[PDB]
Design a binder for this molecule. Structure first.
Ligand code: CHR
Length: 113
């Protein structure tokens, strides 16, 4: 089984709901993180600490956890600085997983009606 991730709902969340992101086939033995982060530029990742979960890829590496994600969301910049409230109505925020080496599986693009 190859790595992947089932996240849902991807849209119709509304400010204050919870989405369920999952991973399957990830590095079987690598603690991956799981949350809502948006790329607003070349190497700019503003994530929100309200969906920051984490689990290690077990035998195959399945990780399913629910978290709260909305349109505007803390733009935590991976550099100690904060980018500001990242309005998901401007950029595309994906719900995905990752590890602490440099990168990991991808994220699912959510939508806000
Ligand atoms: C290994 N580090 C690289 C990685 O960093 C990601 C990252 C971004 C950020 C931020 C700040 O909130 C903090 C802390 C760290 O310092 C602070 O001040 O706050 C964190 C973290 C992170 C954890 C990593 O998650 C991921 O790896 C990740 C990803 O690469 C792509 C999509 C992801 C998605 C969609 C979700 C997700 O769940 C967490 C993780 C990822 O991608 C950045 C673009 C840079 O290249 C970084 O050098």
């Amino acid at each position: 089984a190859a790595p992947t991730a089932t996240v849902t709902p991807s849209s119709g969340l509304s400010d204050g709901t919870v989405v369920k992101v999952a991973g399957a086939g990830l590095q079987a033995g690598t603690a991956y993180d799981v949350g809502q982060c948006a790329w607003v530029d070349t190497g700019v990742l503003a994530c929100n600490p309200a969906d920051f979960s984490s689990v290690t890829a077990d035998a195959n590496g399945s990780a399913s956890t629910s978290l709260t994600v909305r349109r505007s969301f803390e733009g935590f910049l991976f550099d100690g600085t904060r980018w500001g409230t990242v309005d998901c109505t401007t950029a595309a925020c994906q719900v995905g997983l990752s590890d602490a080496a440099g990168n990991g599986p991808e994220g699912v693009a959510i939508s806000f009606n």
